Every structure is written in C-alpha cells, then in structure tokens.
C-alpha cells in the first residue's frame, strides 16, 4: 500500500476529526502483583516515551507497491482455492438487511459501541442514535444510507492497546479504519452470506480460522494438518498488500458468482480515502484493517498468496496435498514433504511482502507441534485424552493483560476471561495464578471458576453436536 496524496482536511471542507489523545488504559489493581514489560501504545506526537517521530512511524507500514499484472502462478493459485471454496456453496445473493444489521446464525449484529465513522462523527451522531437492539428499527438507517450514500471516507484511529517497550519507543502504534456505517452495512449485505459460511466453516476448506473457538478448534487442527508443518510471520501484512492481490481476490470472488458490480467494493478497500485528525489522504493498496470483512478478506488473499509462492518456487508442487488455515495474516500450513520457508520468503519479497521466521525468530527453523503457535497460542495434547488438544496462551501474555484495564468496573469479567485462558497451562500454574490474584483484596471479591470446573466443562464441550 501507498499514500498518494496528503493535504489538510480544512482545504477540502472536512472538519477536524477529533479522536481522544490520552489512553484509556490505566494500571490495574494487580499491576504490582504480576510482572510485565508492556505499556499503552503511543497515541499522540507529544508522548514523552517517544524515541522517534510518531507521524512517520505510524504511516511507515505503507511500504510501497509492486506494479504488476496477475501472473501465471497467481492464476493457478486462484483456481485451486476457488476450487476448494466451490465445495461450500456460497450464496452470492444479498442478505436480508435485518440479518446483516442485527444478527443471524454465523454473523453477529453490528457492534453498537464502535464508531459510525464519517459524517456521523462530525455531526455528533452515534450508532445507538441510528439503531436499536431492542426494536430492530431500520427506517432511520434507511434515511441515512439514502441521505449520505456509499463510498465515504474512512476515519483513521490510533489503536489504544498494550505494546512492547520497543514499539512504544519506535512509536509504531497500529492504525484502524472505521468505515462509514453506511458502507459497513452495504458490505455486510453484499457479502454477509460469505462471512456466514467462513464463520460456520473454519478450517481447511475455507483455509480460515476467523470466527473460531480455540477451546474447540485446536483439537481439529492436527487432524487437518497431518503433514510437515509450515509457519511464518509477516511484518505489516495489511499495509504491504499491493493492488495485484486485490485483483486476485476480485477474480476469486467472480469465480464464486459475485458480479463485477458486487466486487466494486474491493476497490473501496484497495483505493481508499482517509481522514485522520486534521489531515485527509488517499491510499492505493493496503487492506484497511477495521472496515467490514477485513480479516476474512485478508485470510482469503493469504490462501492465494501462499499457493502462489509454493508454485513459483516448487515448480513440481501438487497443491491437492497442501493444507492451510489463516486468521488474516497468521498462517499455519502443511505439506507431506519438507519445505524451505526462506525460499518462499524471498519469493514473497519480490511481490512486496515481508515474511519472517515463525514467532520472532533467528532462522526459518523446523516447526514442530512443540514449538508451533497460532493466534499466539501453543498446542498441547491433553495428558489423559490424547485426541484433545489444549490451546495454551503463554502466562507471560496473560500476566501482561491483567496489569491494566480500560474500566475497573468489568474487572470481574476480565479476570474470568483470563481464567478461561490460563487453566490450559495446567493446575500448578493455575492455582499459582489464583493465589496471586487473591493476594489483593479485590481478588477475593471475585467469583472465580475452580480448575476442576473448567476441566469438566471443557471435556463436556465436545459432547454436544455441531
Ligand atoms: N472479516 C472478518 C472480521 C474479523 C474480525 N476479527 O478481527 O475477528 C472483525 C471483523 C471482521 O469482519 C467481520 C467479522 C465478523 C463479523 Cl460477525 C462481521 C464482520 O464484518 C464487519 C461487520 C461490522 C463491523 N462493524 O463495523 O461493526 C465490522 C466488520 C469488520 N471489521
């Protein structure tokens, strides 16, 4: 992706979008009790922890674009994947507006707490002013959609989350785009049925894990990925995608029965118009992390990308024995024969991607189940039920999360979330975590699930159908 134009909002008539510039993250009541190195991302140029220039830092993920047409390797990749997806039977029929906006099986309602984006943010209007969960009303939305239309600017917020010292220092906070509610809703109509299928069918046919539940899905993964594991990181995936990849997605969607008009929306995503604070800018390429369906479309493209890289390097390759699962940029894959990931990474470089060893990592080492991670979790067969696998978030990551909070009022909810993660590290490690929690008085005011209970509920979770 590449920033093509930057002027001041002022000179084009847009008002200053006024995002909040102080973090919502404050030290929790457990900040002393546990150790960690992470802190709130930098949100403004003044922040005294900066050791570089914020404005430059945040936009620097737009590394450039490789000008190219869709080559022979892309085509066979698109075909093959298109092949897998055909088996799923995806309605290209639009989705009943009420379903797109307020829920249905395999697609949560629109989130009413997130931004409605332009122009509503300028005009003081929020989603709850336009939509009601209680009344499923659509008359107002319908006014707003017709009043204001589609293809509106996006609003660029700086993500307010924990980062490492290095990322705080370098100022490399992630950006998220808010799509105008109108566009959020259009897209959910156009592609709602697609989203629905991928959420309801995570794994090897979709090549996607978006929507999944690790407590349940982990146990399927080694079954679907029986070969020699392949896995790697990207640096700045979303922003590194050149237009050619969007082109491939377009094709892929057309083979699915979407028509040219139905695919204009990808150009919305690819060639984007953005508002940030007091500046206004266009971008050619890059996925705008946060708009409708961006994880799905990232995943889809990643399935096209990897296949493309295997083809261009391993000319004799048989893709029908390849298997991958993506969550946006996070991949785990397998083939029955060993594969040199570094070869792919240098193939990738040529298409403008920056692929790196799985986890931060010295070399593209061999990946085992011992060392494999996906969505930041490890895999560990249950000692007693070997066909069940535990998703194991590192307590390092759990410790970091519990030491902060955006709202102490949810402390209980927060800690029970972390409890559902922690017990996969096993009973000693759980009980110790609970001791430390209970070493402050708030600890003891919380209803916390017992190890034994989490275990039983997990085991019984495999009993009832799906
Ligand atoms: N793609 C996928 C995806 C993955 C994540 N994810 O990181 O898990 C978050 C959003 C994603 O798109 C959708 C995913 C799930 C559902 Cl149920 C709907 C999705 O489409 C959207 C719809 C509405 C809004 N909204 O403005 O409220 C945003 C999106 C997007 N963003």
Author numbering: 1 to 466
Quote from the publication.
The genome is replicated via a negative-sense RNA intermediate by 3Dpol, the viral RNA-dependent RNA polymerase (RdRP). For this, 3Dpol uses the viral protein 3B, in this context usually termed VPg (viral protein genome-linked), as a primer. These enzymes adopt a classical right hand architecture, with fingers, palm and thumb subdomains providing the correct geometrical arrangement of substrate molecules and metal ions at the polymerase active site for catalysis. Given its critical role in genome replication, 3Dpol is regarded as an attractive target for antiviral drugs.
The analysis of the difference electron density maps revealed the presence of extra densities to position the inhibitor within a pocket located at the bottom of the template channel, mimicking the position of the template acceptor nucleotide, the nucleotide which will base-pair with the incoming nucleotide. The compound bound in a conformation that perfectly fitted the shape of the pocket formed by residues L107, E108, L110, D111, T114 of motif G, R188, Y195, H199 of motif F, T294, S295, I296 of motif B and Y327 of motif A. Among all contacts observed, the stacking interaction between Y195 and the central chlorophenyl ring of GPC-N114 appeared to be an important determinant of binding. This tyrosine is strictly conserved in enterovirus polymerases but not conserved in FMDV and EMCV. The first 2-cyano-4-nitrophenyl ring was oriented towards the entrance of the template channel, interacting with residues of motif G and B of CVB3 3Dpol, whereas the second 2-cyano-4-nitrophenyl ring appeared partially exposed to the solvent, occupying the position expected for the template acceptor base. This preservation of the template cavity conformation extended to the interacting side chains, which maintained their native conformation upon GPC-N114 binding. GPC-N114 did not compete with incoming NTPs, but interfered with productive binding of the template-primer to 3Dpol in a primer elongation assay. This is in agreement with the crystallographic studies of the CVB3 3Dpol–GPC-N114 complex which revealed that the binding site of the compound is located at the junction of the palm and the fingers domains, and overlaps partially with the binding site of the template. Hence, GPC-N114 is the first reported picornavirus polymerase inhibitor that binds the site of the template acceptor nucleotide.
